[PDB]
């Protein structure tokens, strides 16, 4: 079942990604990369305070429509 999630960077820049609960985290990174130009390995992708397992899905982290993932692009 399709859901729109927000990916928000440290600059407050926001992007919307329409995903499904079964989509893997690696996949979510790749689509952030489509948009932001950051290689997935170069992304620090954060939800509920922790980084996300590449092999785990969005449902694994109880992400829902409107959930905000935090994209930190800093060392």
């Amino acid at each position: 079942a399709a859901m729109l999630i927000k990916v928000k960077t440290l600059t407050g820049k926001e992007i919307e990604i329409d995903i499904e609960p079964t989509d893997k985290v690696e996949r979510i990174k790749e689509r952030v990369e489509e948009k932001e130009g950051i290689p997935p390995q170069q992304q620090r992708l954060i939800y509920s305070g922790k980084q996300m397992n590449d092999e785990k899905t969005a449902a694994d982290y109880k992400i829902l429509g409107g959930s905000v993932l935090h994209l930190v692009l800093a060392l």
């Binding site: 440290l10 600059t11 950051i38 290689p39 509920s48 305070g49 935090h70 800093a74 060392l75």
Partner: protein, 245 residues
Amino acid sequence: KHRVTLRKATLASLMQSLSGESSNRVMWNDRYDTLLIARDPREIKNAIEKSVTDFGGLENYKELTGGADPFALMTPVAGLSANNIFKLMTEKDVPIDPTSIEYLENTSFAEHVNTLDSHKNYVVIVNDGRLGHKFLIDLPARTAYIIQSDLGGGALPAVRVEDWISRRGSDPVSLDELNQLLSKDFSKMPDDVQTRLLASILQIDKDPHKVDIKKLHLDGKLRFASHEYDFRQFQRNAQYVAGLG
């Protein structure tokens, strides 16, 4: 060969200015469909302040980000340095959006650079899917330099762009070695060849032992695109960033 000193001075002057709050936020901002030099230190901070309010104050926003303070002076992961320095180098009066550039996927890097006017400066933006990495090759009017930083999570250790520029920014790279590294066949070269090219080109201390090729994605795509630039424009963009005080 006194342009090499100009170029070094510009980068040096640029990197040092990043200790300034305003310069720091203008350099590494992530609005790309607009001119770098159109970036307004204070709009940027207002948008930061808005998202820290939205998320329950700084202390809470920090937990959400796993510790990252958005007001802090940052240094970028590879893509963000790649995108932004690319803009600084290539922009005059038209926004350039490194996020929507067209890459070469089936061209050889050597075959590509032979195609280039030796009378022009080019910058090449490398999206390397074997290294999970993104970095710049500056080809001033043949001589090559690397601009980069790195989160540190793949074959190459973490590096701050300030430190990279300081040690490596003005230290020319072997084109031949670049041809080899940006080969499709790079994935198939012997271990010690891979680690030596990665060290030579990409590692701050040219040290093979600090490269770990087990973290190479052997089926990674290697994408690159070039773009000419006026040196004077680059200097000027860097003067705006650096002059922010």
